[PDB]
Amino acid sequence: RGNVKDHMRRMLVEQHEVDRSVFKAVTTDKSVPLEHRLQVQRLFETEVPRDSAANRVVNRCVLTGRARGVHRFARLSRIMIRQLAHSGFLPGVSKAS
RNA sequence: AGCUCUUGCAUUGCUGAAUUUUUUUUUUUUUUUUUUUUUUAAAAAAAAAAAAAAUUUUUUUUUUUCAAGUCAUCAUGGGGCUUAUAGAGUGGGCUACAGGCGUAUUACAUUGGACACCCACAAGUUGCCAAAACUGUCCGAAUAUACGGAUUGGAGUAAAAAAAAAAAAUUUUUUAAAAUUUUUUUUUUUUUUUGCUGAAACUAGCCUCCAUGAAGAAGGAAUCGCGAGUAAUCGUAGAUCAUUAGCGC
RNA sequence: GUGGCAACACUAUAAAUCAAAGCAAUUGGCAGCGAUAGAGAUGCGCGGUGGAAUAUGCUGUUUAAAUCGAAUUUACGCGCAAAAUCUUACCACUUUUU
């Protein structure tokens, strides 16, 4: 399915690098500025791409277009993990016990 | 070229079910004797005897049938679509709520609740951490109990540690007593504390603390599951995950 | 036609159709036919459900959409090992390219 559209979202997290967003987040998590955090947070999460915060990423699979049931254990999805596992074309993951 | 459009009765793949049990009876090594093939030699073959035994924390693994399920896993046959069955953007909805059903959890207490304890011993030191309980103490009036913890409002708050100087022998009762030899000033100072995480938590997260405290006093007909470290009970840690699993796995 | 008191007892062919009707040993499905083995297979126990509330899934109702499949056993803590936007395919609106 649409694995690449998420890669575009990941690229927007990094083209408009998260550092710029998080540094503005630093000044809104500081209570030292008495106010203007409302002004800083008023824009700067709206001029900043709303599709670049780190929650819109949904961590899809890479083999296929799986969007549900993924694994970071070996960057694959369950049915493929089983297919590669029985094939053994994977780093030594055997049937258990 | 693209479909998340159809067709699982066109399909590959993968799985469901119970067919719940069978997966040890079989070889190999050695000995003795002997014979089959090749211009100084190995295997081979045959009669008998003895031993080695059969993978993993103990389940996986081997299994027959349902046009069983899935075209939204991808794939792909056929058909359909291409100003829309194609892509974006913003916000919903995928979680709504007479009824009814399935699966779980929590109780309806005293074999218990609470609170403390030592903060009891684990799976789990490989390139330290619990709970039930044991010991102590409070509670047993149909109280709906100090059981239970559903719904609903409301609010997001305390400190503890100790250092240096000046002074020093002060605070509190009755009509006779009491606490300090540290009282009152300045400078200090840590460690926690901040509601959390996210851009945004009303619906619709979660946390903490108040308050309101529901049913429920063990459940018919009916029925399911399981005979040893098993049921039940008790935590624990892993996944996906910004956080959300309390009950799911 | 013969016998009888008869029920009828004989003797006795065909017309007409069909392409098999049959037979014996089996090999399988039945048992409302027995002997031997095995399963909490029961009657033997424990704990559940169904009673209450919450969670959670499904139908049904409505809504603009409540996206779509799973459908008796083996569907209903199922695809979802997680939906606040995104995931998301559904709707309202505004655009885009063939």
Coordinates of C-alpha atoms (C1' of nucleotides) in Angstrom, one line a residue:
Chain A
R1 CA 0.0 0.0 0.0
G2 CA 1.2 3.6 0.7
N3 CA 4.5 3.0 2.5
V4 CA 6.1 5.9 0.6
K5 CA 3.5 8.6 1.7
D6 CA 4.6 8.0 5.3
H7 CA 8.3 8.3 4.1
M8 CA 7.2 11.8 2.8
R9 CA 5.8 12.5 6.3
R10 CA 9.1 11.3 7.8
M11 CA 11.1 13.5 5.3
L12 CA 8.9 16.5 6.4
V13 CA 9.8 15.7 10.0
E14 CA 13.4 16.0 8.9
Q15 CA 13.3 18.6 6.1
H16 CA 11.6 21.0 8.5
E17 CA 13.9 19.3 11.0
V18 CA 12.3 18.5 14.4
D19 CA 15.1 20.6 16.0
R20 CA 13.4 23.8 15.0
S21 CA 10.1 22.6 16.4
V22 CA 11.6 21.1 19.6
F23 CA 13.7 24.3 20.3
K24 CA 10.4 26.3 20.2
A25 CA 9.0 23.5 22.4
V26 CA 12.0 24.2 24.7
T27 CA 10.8 27.8 25.2
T28 CA 7.2 26.7 25.8
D29 CA 8.3 24.0 28.4
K30 CA 10.4 26.7 30.1
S31 CA 8.2 28.6 32.7
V32 CA 11.0 31.2 32.9
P33 CA 9.5 33.4 30.1
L34 CA 6.5 34.6 32.2
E35 CA 4.2 34.7 29.0
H36 CA 4.6 34.9 25.2
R37 CA 4.7 31.1 25.3
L38 CA 1.1 31.4 24.2
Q39 CA 2.4 33.7 21.4
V40 CA 5.3 31.3 20.6
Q41 CA 3.0 28.3 20.7
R42 CA 0.2 30.4 19.0
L43 CA 2.2 30.2 15.8
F44 CA 5.3 28.0 15.4
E45 CA 3.2 24.8 15.5
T46 CA 1.0 26.4 12.7
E47 CA 3.6 28.1 10.5
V48 CA 5.6 24.9 11.3
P49 CA 4.2 21.9 9.2
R50 CA 1.4 20.3 11.2
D51 CA 2.3 17.1 9.4
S52 CA 5.8 17.2 10.8
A53 CA 5.1 16.5 14.5
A54 CA 6.3 13.0 15.6
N55 CA 2.8 11.6 16.2
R56 CA 1.5 11.6 12.6
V57 CA 4.1 8.9 11.7
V58 CA 2.3 5.6 12.1
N59 CA 5.4 3.2 11.7
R60 CA 4.2 1.0 8.8
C61 CA 6.1 -2.1 7.6
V62 CA 8.7 -2.0 4.9
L63 CA 8.2 -5.3 3.1
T64 CA 4.5 -4.8 1.8
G65 CA 2.4 -1.9 2.8
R66 CA 1.3 -3.3 6.1
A67 CA 0.0 -0.4 8.3
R68 CA -1.1 -2.7 11.2
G69 CA 0.8 -5.5 13.0
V70 CA 4.4 -4.3 12.4
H71 CA 7.5 -5.4 14.3
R72 CA 10.6 -3.3 15.1
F73 CA 12.2 -6.6 16.2
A74 CA 13.5 -7.1 12.6
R75 CA 11.7 -4.3 10.7
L76 CA 9.1 -6.6 9.1
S77 CA 5.4 -7.6 9.5
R78 CA 4.0 -10.9 11.0
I79 CA 2.9 -12.9 7.9
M80 CA 6.2 -11.9 6.1
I81 CA 8.2 -12.7 9.3
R82 CA 6.7 -16.2 9.3
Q83 CA 7.3 -16.6 5.5
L84 CA 10.9 -15.5 5.8
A85 CA 11.3 -17.5 9.0
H86 CA 10.2 -20.8 7.5
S87 CA 12.4 -20.0 4.5
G88 CA 15.1 -19.2 6.9
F89 CA 16.1 -16.1 4.9
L90 CA 16.3 -14.1 8.1
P91 CA 19.0 -13.9 10.8
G92 CA 18.7 -17.2 12.7
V93 CA 15.1 -17.0 14.0
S94 CA 14.0 -20.6 14.4
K95 CA 10.7 -22.2 15.6
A96 CA 11.0 -21.9 19.5
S97 CA 12.0 -24.8 21.9
Chain B
rA1 C1' -1.1 3.2 -15.5
rG2 C1' -4.0 3.2 -11.2
rC3 C1' -7.7 1.4 -8.0
rU4 C1' -9.4 -0.2 -0.5
rC5 C1' -14.2 -2.0 -7.1
rU6 C1' -16.3 -7.0 -7.8
rU7 C1' -15.5 -12.3 -7.9
rG8 C1' -12.6 -16.8 -1.9
rC9 C1' -18.1 -21.0 -6.3
rA10 C1' -12.0 -18.6 -11.2
rU11 C1' -7.2 -18.6 -7.8
rU12 C1' -1.6 -19.0 -5.4
rG13 C1' -0.2 -18.4 -0.6
rC14 C1' -1.4 -18.9 4.5
rU15 C1' -4.8 -20.6 8.2
rG16 C1' -9.4 -22.6 10.9
rA17 C1' -11.9 -27.2 12.7
rA18 C1' -11.7 -31.9 15.3
rU19 C1' -9.6 -36.5 12.7
rU20 C1' -6.6 -34.5 19.8
rU21 C1' -3.3 -39.5 19.3
rU22 C1' 0.5 -41.8 17.0
rU23 C1' 5.3 -39.8 17.1
rU24 C1' 9.0 -45.4 19.4
rU25 C1' 10.4 -49.6 17.5
rU26 C1' 14.4 -49.2 14.4
rU27 C1' 19.3 -48.7 12.8
rU28 C1' 24.5 -47.9 13.6
rU29 C1' 29.6 -49.3 15.8
rU30 C1' 32.6 -53.6 16.9
rU31 C1' 33.8 -58.9 16.7
rU32 C1' 34.0 -63.8 14.2
rU33 C1' 33.5 -66.6 9.6
rU34 C1' 33.0 -66.2 4.3
rU35 C1' 32.7 -64.2 -0.8
rU36 C1' 31.4 -59.8 -5.3
rU37 C1' 33.8 -56.1 -8.3
rU38 C1' 39.1 -54.1 -10.4
rU39 C1' 45.7 -54.3 -12.9
rU40 C1' 49.7 -53.7 -4.8
rA41 C1' 44.7 -52.6 -2.8
rA42 C1' 39.1 -50.3 -1.1
rA43 C1' 34.2 -50.8 -1.0
rA44 C1' 30.4 -54.4 -1.5
rA45 C1' 27.8 -58.9 -0.1
rA46 C1' 26.3 -62.8 3.4
rA47 C1' 25.6 -66.0 8.7
rA48 C1' 25.8 -65.0 13.9
rA49 C1' 27.0 -62.4 18.4
rA50 C1' 27.7 -58.1 21.6
rA51 C1' 27.4 -52.6 22.8
rA52 C1' 25.9 -47.2 21.1
rA53 C1' 21.7 -45.5 20.9
rA54 C1' 17.4 -42.5 18.8
rU55 C1' 15.8 -33.9 18.4
rU56 C1' 14.0 -29.5 22.7
rU57 C1' 13.3 -28.2 28.0
rU58 C1' 9.2 -31.0 26.8
rU59 C1' 6.7 -28.5 23.8
rU60 C1' 7.3 -27.8 18.7
rU61 C1' 7.8 -31.1 14.8
rU62 C1' 4.7 -35.8 11.4
rU63 C1' -0.4 -35.9 10.1
rU64 C1' -7.0 -37.0 6.2
rU65 C1' -12.0 -33.2 5.4
rC66 C1' -14.8 -29.1 4.6
rA67 C1' -16.1 -25.0 -3.2
rA68 C1' -14.3 -23.9 5.4
rG69 C1' -12.0 -18.3 5.5
rU70 C1' -9.0 -14.3 3.2
rC71 C1' -9.1 -10.3 -3.9
rA72 C1' -8.7 -4.9 2.5
rU73 C1' -1.5 -8.8 3.2
rC74 C1' 0.6 -8.6 -1.4
rA75 C1' -0.2 -11.1 -5.7
rU76 C1' -3.3 -12.4 -9.8
rG77 C1' -7.4 -14.7 -13.9
rG78 C1' -12.2 -12.5 -15.5
rG79 C1' -15.3 -8.3 -15.3
rG80 C1' -16.0 -2.8 -13.8
rC81 C1' -14.0 2.2 -13.2
rU82 C1' -11.1 6.5 -14.8
rU83 C1' -14.8 14.7 -13.8
rA84 C1' -14.0 9.9 -10.5
rU85 C1' -14.5 3.5 -7.8
rA86 C1' -7.8 8.7 -8.8
rG87 C1' -4.8 12.0 -5.2
rA88 C1' -4.7 16.0 -1.6
rG89 C1' -6.6 19.5 2.3
rU90 C1' -9.8 20.5 6.8
rG91 C1' -13.1 18.5 10.3
rG92 C1' -16.1 14.5 11.7
rG93 C1' -17.2 8.9 11.7
rC94 C1' -14.9 4.0 12.1
rU95 C1' -16.2 4.1 19.7
rA96 C1' -23.6 6.1 18.2
rC97 C1' -27.4 2.9 22.0
rA98 C1' -34.9 0.5 23.0
rG99 C1' -33.3 -4.4 23.0
rG100 C1' -30.8 -9.1 22.8
rC101 C1' -26.3 -12.3 22.6
rG102 C1' -21.0 -13.8 23.2
rU103 C1' -16.1 -13.2 26.0
rA104 C1' -13.5 -11.4 30.4
rU105 C1' -12.7 -8.7 35.1
rU106 C1' -14.2 -7.0 39.9
rA107 C1' -16.7 -8.2 43.9
rC108 C1' -20.9 -9.7 46.9
rA109 C1' -16.4 -10.6 52.8
rU110 C1' -14.0 -12.6 58.0
rU111 C1' -10.3 -18.3 55.1
rG112 C1' -11.8 -10.9 55.0
rG113 C1' -10.8 -5.3 54.6
rA114 C1' -7.2 -1.7 56.1
rC115 C1' -2.3 -0.2 57.9
rA116 C1' 2.7 -1.1 59.1
rC117 C1' 6.7 -4.6 58.8
rC118 C1' 11.7 -6.7 56.6
rC119 C1' 10.3 -2.9 52.4
rA120 C1' 10.3 -11.3 53.0
rC121 C1' 12.6 -14.6 49.4
rA122 C1' 11.9 -15.1 42.3
rA123 C1' 11.8 -16.2 37.4
rG124 C1' 16.4 -12.5 36.1
rU125 C1' 24.2 -10.7 37.5
rU126 C1' 26.2 -12.1 32.3
rG127 C1' 29.5 -8.7 27.3
rC128 C1' 19.5 -5.6 40.4
rC129 C1' 13.0 -5.4 41.1
rA130 C1' 7.4 -7.7 43.3
rA131 C1' 2.6 -9.5 45.2
rA132 C1' -0.5 -13.3 48.1
rA133 C1' 1.2 -14.8 52.9
rC134 C1' 3.9 -15.3 57.3
rU135 C1' 4.3 -11.1 62.4
rG136 C1' 1.9 -6.9 64.8
rU137 C1' -2.5 -3.5 65.3
rC138 C1' -7.8 -1.6 64.2
rC139 C1' -12.6 -3.4 62.6
rG140 C1' -18.0 -7.7 62.6
rA141 C1' -24.9 -3.0 64.1
rA142 C1' -28.6 -6.0 57.8
rU143 C1' -24.2 -2.1 59.3
rA144 C1' -25.0 -2.7 53.3
rU145 C1' -20.6 -2.7 57.4
rA146 C1' -14.2 0.6 57.9
rC147 C1' -17.3 -5.1 52.2
rG148 C1' -17.7 -3.7 47.5
rG149 C1' -16.0 0.8 43.9
rA150 C1' -19.8 1.3 39.2
rU151 C1' -21.8 6.5 38.0
rU152 C1' -21.4 11.8 39.0
rG153 C1' -19.6 16.9 40.5
rG154 C1' -15.1 19.5 41.8
rA155 C1' -9.9 20.7 42.2
rG156 C1' -5.0 20.2 40.0
rU157 C1' -0.7 22.8 46.2
rA158 C1' 2.1 20.0 50.4
rA159 C1' 7.6 20.1 51.7
rA160 C1' 12.1 17.4 53.9
rA161 C1' 17.6 17.8 54.4
rA162 C1' 21.5 20.7 56.3
rA163 C1' 25.7 25.0 56.3
rA164 C1' 28.0 30.1 57.9
rA165 C1' 27.9 34.6 61.0
rA166 C1' 25.6 38.1 65.0
rA167 C1' 23.1 37.4 69.7
rA168 C1' 22.1 33.9 73.5
rA169 C1' 20.5 31.6 78.1
rU170 C1' 13.4 31.5 75.9
rU171 C1' 8.3 29.6 74.8
rU172 C1' 3.5 27.8 77.5
rU173 C1' -0.5 26.7 81.5
rU174 C1' -3.8 26.9 86.2
rU175 C1' -3.6 29.2 90.8
rA176 C1' 1.1 26.1 91.5
rA177 C1' 3.7 24.4 87.5
rA178 C1' 5.6 22.7 82.3
rA179 C1' 9.0 22.1 77.2
rU180 C1' 15.1 25.0 76.1
rU181 C1' 19.8 26.4 77.7
rU182 C1' 19.3 26.4 72.4
rU183 C1' 15.5 30.8 71.2
rU184 C1' 15.5 35.5 67.0
rU185 C1' 18.3 38.0 62.7
rU186 C1' 21.1 37.7 58.3
rU187 C1' 23.2 35.0 54.4
rU188 C1' 22.8 30.3 52.6
rU189 C1' 22.0 26.1 50.4
rU190 C1' 20.6 20.9 48.4
rU191 C1' 16.9 17.1 47.1
rU192 C1' 12.3 16.3 45.5
rU193 C1' 8.1 19.1 44.2
rU194 C1' 6.1 20.8 38.8
rG195 C1' -0.6 17.2 36.6
rC196 C1' 1.8 13.6 32.2
rU197 C1' 2.8 12.9 27.1
rG198 C1' 2.0 15.0 22.8
rA199 C1' 1.1 20.7 18.3
rA200 C1' -3.7 20.3 20.2
rA201 C1' -6.3 15.6 25.6
rC202 C1' -14.3 18.6 26.1
rU203 C1' -16.6 14.4 23.2
rA204 C1' -12.5 11.0 23.4
rG205 C1' -6.7 9.6 26.5
rC206 C1' -4.2 9.0 31.1
rC207 C1' -2.5 10.6 36.0
rU208 C1' -3.2 12.4 41.3
rC209 C1' -6.6 14.1 45.3
rC210 C1' -11.2 15.4 47.3
rA211 C1' -16.4 14.6 47.4
rU212 C1' -21.5 11.2 45.8
rG213 C1' -21.2 6.1 47.2
rA214 C1' -25.2 2.4 42.8
rA215 C1' -26.3 -2.8 42.1
rG216 C1' -24.3 -6.9 44.3
rA217 C1' -25.3 -10.7 50.7
rA218 C1' -22.7 -16.5 45.8
rG219 C1' -26.8 -16.4 40.9
rG220 C1' -32.7 -21.0 38.1
rA221 C1' -33.7 -23.8 33.7
rA222 C1' -29.4 -25.0 31.4
rU223 C1' -24.2 -25.8 30.8
rC224 C1' -18.8 -25.4 30.1
rG225 C1' -13.6 -26.3 31.3
rC226 C1' -9.9 -29.2 33.8
rG227 C1' -7.6 -35.0 37.2
rA228 C1' 0.4 -32.4 39.7
rG229 C1' 3.5 -28.2 40.6
rU230 C1' -3.0 -28.7 37.3
rA231 C1' -7.4 -25.6 38.6
rA232 C1' -7.7 -21.3 41.3
rU233 C1' -5.2 -17.1 43.4
rC234 C1' -1.1 -13.8 43.2
rG235 C1' 2.0 -10.6 41.0
rU236 C1' 5.6 -10.0 37.3
rA237 C1' 7.6 -8.4 31.5
rG238 C1' 7.2 -8.4 26.4
rA239 C1' 4.8 -6.7 22.1
rU240 C1' 2.7 -2.7 19.3
rC241 C1' 3.4 1.9 21.2
rA242 C1' 4.5 10.1 22.1
rU243 C1' 1.0 8.6 26.0
rU244 C1' -3.1 5.5 26.3
rA245 C1' -3.5 -3.0 27.7
rG246 C1' -7.1 -1.6 34.4
rC247 C1' -9.6 -6.2 32.2
rG248 C1' -7.1 -7.9 25.7
rC249 C1' -3.0 -11.0 24.1
Chain C
rG1 C1' -60.9 -79.3 -21.4
rU2 C1' -60.9 -83.1 -16.7
rG3 C1' -62.3 -83.2 -10.8
rG4 C1' -65.6 -81.2 -7.1
rC5 C1' -70.3 -80.1 -2.6
rA6 C1' -67.0 -76.1 -3.6
rA7 C1' -63.2 -72.7 -2.2
rC8 C1' -60.7 -73.7 -6.9
rA9 C1' -56.8 -78.1 -8.0
rC10 C1' -54.7 -78.7 -12.6
rU11 C1' -53.1 -78.5 -17.9
rA12 C1' -51.8 -74.1 -20.3
rU13 C1' -49.6 -70.1 -23.5
rA14 C1' -49.2 -65.8 -25.0
rA15 C1' -49.9 -61.0 -26.6
rA16 C1' -47.2 -56.2 -25.5
rU17 C1' -42.9 -53.6 -23.9
rC18 C1' -37.9 -53.2 -21.7
rA19 C1' -31.8 -53.4 -22.2
rA20 C1' -30.9 -54.9 -18.4
rA21 C1' -33.7 -57.6 -14.6
rG22 C1' -29.9 -61.0 -12.1
rC23 C1' -25.8 -64.3 -9.4
rA24 C1' -21.1 -65.2 -6.3
rA25 C1' -16.7 -63.7 -3.7
rU26 C1' -15.3 -59.5 -2.2
rU27 C1' -13.6 -53.6 -1.0
rG28 C1' -15.7 -49.8 1.4
rG29 C1' -20.9 -47.0 4.9
rC30 C1' -24.1 -48.5 8.4
rA31 C1' -25.3 -51.9 14.1
rG32 C1' -31.5 -50.7 16.8
rC33 C1' -25.1 -57.9 16.7
rG34 C1' -20.9 -59.3 20.7
rA35 C1' -15.6 -59.9 22.8
rU36 C1' -10.7 -57.3 23.7
rA37 C1' -8.0 -51.8 24.3
rG38 C1' -8.2 -46.0 24.9
rA39 C1' -10.1 -40.8 26.3
rG40 C1' -12.1 -35.7 34.1
rA41 C1' -15.5 -40.3 28.4
rU42 C1' -18.7 -39.7 32.3
rG43 C1' -21.5 -40.7 37.4
rC44 C1' -16.0 -38.9 41.1
rG45 C1' -14.1 -33.0 42.6
rC46 C1' -13.0 -27.8 41.8
rG47 C1' -13.9 -23.2 39.6
rG48 C1' -16.6 -20.4 36.1
rU49 C1' -21.0 -18.8 33.0
rG50 C1' -26.2 -17.4 32.8
rG51 C1' -27.7 -12.7 38.7
rA52 C1' -25.1 -6.9 39.4
rA53 C1' -21.7 -3.1 37.2
rU54 C1' -17.6 -2.1 34.1
rA55 C1' -14.5 -3.4 30.0
rU56 C1' -14.9 -5.7 25.3
rG57 C1' -16.8 -7.9 20.6
rC58 C1' -21.6 -8.8 17.5
rU59 C1' -26.6 -8.0 15.7
rG60 C1' -30.5 -4.5 15.4
rU61 C1' -31.9 0.8 15.4
rU62 C1' -30.9 5.6 13.8
rU63 C1' -27.2 9.0 11.5
rA64 C1' -24.2 12.2 6.5
rA65 C1' -20.9 8.2 7.3
rA66 C1' -21.4 4.9 11.9
rU67 C1' -15.7 2.2 6.0
rC68 C1' -15.3 -3.4 4.9
rG69 C1' -14.9 -8.6 5.6
rA70 C1' -15.4 -12.8 9.9
rA71 C1' -21.7 -15.7 10.4
rU72 C1' -23.9 -22.8 13.7
rU73 C1' -20.1 -25.6 15.6
rU74 C1' -14.2 -23.5 14.5
rA75 C1' -17.9 -15.6 14.3
rC76 C1' -18.6 -12.6 18.6
rG77 C1' -10.8 -9.6 23.7
rC78 C1' -12.1 -11.6 15.2
rG79 C1' -8.7 -9.1 11.0
rC80 C1' -7.3 -4.4 15.1
rA81 C1' -0.1 -6.9 19.1
rA82 C1' -4.2 -0.9 20.1
rA83 C1' -8.8 5.1 16.0
rA84 C1' -7.4 12.0 20.0
rU85 C1' -5.8 14.4 13.8
rC86 C1' -2.7 10.9 11.0
rU87 C1' -3.8 5.0 11.2
rU88 C1' -8.5 5.0 7.3
rA89 C1' -10.4 2.9 2.9
rC90 C1' -16.6 6.3 4.9
rC91 C1' -19.1 11.1 5.1
rA92 C1' -19.7 17.1 4.5
rC93 C1' -17.1 20.9 2.0
rU94 C1' -13.1 23.0 -1.3
rU95 C1' -9.5 22.0 -4.9
rU96 C1' -6.4 19.0 -8.1
rU97 C1' -4.7 15.4 -12.9
rU98 C1' -6.2 11.8 -16.7

